[PDB]
């Protein structure tokens, strides 16, 4: 509940994206884990990038995560999106099992066009 971020963010494939999530500027939240996880119909966040350094094997080079304790913020940058990335996600801190977190939705769509007449 004390975490705050954007509800839904849309972009199309090949582009970059940058997401910001907020936490109260206390001591621990300036000095503890931040994460970006992805859930599904299987019961559990699978961690994709962490503030401690670990990046998921499927996200190497794709994305990273940075924390600005002075802004009371941490930022998530994703590039090279695809349609396989659209789903439900969560920003959050501390142990993934609890919910000191915030839920994010993500929808990726292909870059349309191909019509020189429009």
């Amino acid at each position: 509940s004390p975490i705050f971020g954007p509800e839904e963010v849309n972009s199309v494939e090949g582009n970059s994206v940058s997401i910001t999530c907020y936490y109260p500027p206390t001591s621990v939240n300036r000095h503890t884990r931040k994460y970006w996880c992805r859930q599904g119909a299987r019961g559990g966040c699978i961690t994709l990038i962490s503030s401690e350094g670990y990046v998921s094997s499927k996200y190497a080079g794709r994305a990273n995560l940075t924390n600005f304790p002075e802004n009371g913020t941490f930022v998530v940058n994703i590039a090279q999106l695809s349609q396989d990335d659209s789903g439900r996600y969560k920003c959050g801190l501390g142990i993934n099992s609890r919910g000191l977190s915030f839920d994010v939705s993500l929808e990726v769509s292909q870059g349309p066009g191909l019509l020189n007449d429009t």
Binding site: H31, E52, G53, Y54
Partner: protein, 227 residues
């Protein structure tokens, strides 16, 4: 004639605030009139060095070069030079050491694995693996502690840093301890401590006994009164 330049650990500093820096030469020839001089990067020499080594029993002859500096100086990161001037090769060899710059700070994540039940069936000895992980820069220090009495290091052995396969920068290390199973069967928890310069108060630690580590048995007996 081989020289080890020995920079003090961050741990040695922080537990002494006494940043002695030394350089040892190993298996040279102990003549007398062995001379080594500590100088800064400027060439200017520094305080002297006393209590210097003597001839070893097994011809692996040695000479300790003691020195001192101000801690901020090492934090400033300028090259330090002890140079060997002995008649064996009166050519002055150059031992230049510094502090790297640009290393970020990262914390140890000390887990502590308990001995495998299999080893408990060879029925004599038990082993516990204090672990540190994902930390920068190098040179963590660790020791083991139990029942409020320290454990003289000949019980435990520790690794040194070496990079993670996955983390581009973060090193890790180990420690191993061997104890009679009955001693671990006695209960008799154990605490491994780590000191490292990305840790808030510089020192964290964890513990384990028979009950904490991988118990087959969960015995909660919780009472909830006056709903």
């Amino acid at each position: 004639i081989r020289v080890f330049a020995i920079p003090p650990s961050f741990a040695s500093i922080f537990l002494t605030k006494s940043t002695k820096l030394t350089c040892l030469v190993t298996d040279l020839t102990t003549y007398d009139s062995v001379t080594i001089s500590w100088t800064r990067q400027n060439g200017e020499a520094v305080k002297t060095h006393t209590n210097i080594s003597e001839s070893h029993p097994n011809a692996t002859f040695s000479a300790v070069g003691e020195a001192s500096i101000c801690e901020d100086d090492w934090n400033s990161g300028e090259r330090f030079t002890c140079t060997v001037t002995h008649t064996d090769l009166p050519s002055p060899l150059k031992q230049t050491i510094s502090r790297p710059k640009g290393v970020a700070l990262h914390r140890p994540d000390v887990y502590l694995l308990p001995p495998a039940r299999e080893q408990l069936n060879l029925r004599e000895s038990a082993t516990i693996t204090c672990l540190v992980t994902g930390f920068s820069p190098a040179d963590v220090f660790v020791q083991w502690m139990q029942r409020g009495q320290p454990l003289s290091p000949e019980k435990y052995v520790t690794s040194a840093p070496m990079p993670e396969p996955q983390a581009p920068g973060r090193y890790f290390a180990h420690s191993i301890l061997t104890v009679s199973e009955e001693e671990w069967n006695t209960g008799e928890t154990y605490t491994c401590v780590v000191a490292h310069e990305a840790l808030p108060n510089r020192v964290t630690e964890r513990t384990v006994d028979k009950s904490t580590g991988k118990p087959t048995l969960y015995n909660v007996s919780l009472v909830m009164s006056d709903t």
